[PDB]
Amino acid sequence: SMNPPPPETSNPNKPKRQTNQLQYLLRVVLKTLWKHQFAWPFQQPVDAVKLNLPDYYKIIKTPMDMGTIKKRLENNYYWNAQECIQDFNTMFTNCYIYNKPGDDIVLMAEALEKLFLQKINELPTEE
Ligand SMILES: O=c1cc(N2CCOCC2)oc2c(-c3ccccc3)cccc12
Structure with a gap:
């Protein structure tokens, strides 16, 4: 038995940007759930x-984790x-x-999701 390579975390062909919602997801949501x-x-x-x-x-063909x-x-x-919320x-x-x-x-997942939904409920508007 073998584990797959982990999901992509870098891809120079994929367009990306900083946004206030993405910064919130890192500084508030991820930080809090972690x-x-x-x-x-x-x-x-x-x-x-x-x-x-x-x-x-x-069974799980789209694995994902907070790491x-x-x-x-x-x-x-x-x-x-x-994109992040979907992950x-x-x-x-x-x-x-x-x-x-x-x-x-x-x-355990349900506990994290409760906190998740609390935090997304207060997702800031796009700046
Ligand atoms: O969906 C999952 C099913 C499991 N399992 C199946 C039931 O017995 C325990 C391991 O484990 C998971 C873990 C995990 C649990 C314990 C230790 C390390 C990782 C992390 C995230 C998702 C899962």
Whole structure:
């Protein structure tokens, strides 16, 4: 069994820009979720080899994690906030898809998503 290469965090062909929404997503949203007590499983890609989940990357074909998102925000990978918000939502949805409702990992993802939705609710207007 083998893990895939992690998601792209640098691509000079992909257009990108700094925006006030993207800065908020880094300084407020990512920062806040990262320090959550249940953040740790989501701070890097799922290691399906170490966790003995040989079917994980057969079920989850768009993996995402906050380590990747952090790198993307820090390296200004995105064109807009929606691209980043989609990465977060993919991360949560991956977890809800692969696991049964009420599992520990799902509860942890649901906690982060609650804080996520709190923070996106107060997403600033474009400057
Ligand atoms: O969807 C997932 C399913 C799992 N699993 C399956 C159930 O047993 C535990 C491992 O683990 C995940 C982890 C993770 C959990 C513990 C340690 C390291 C990573 C991080 C993010 C998503 C998942």
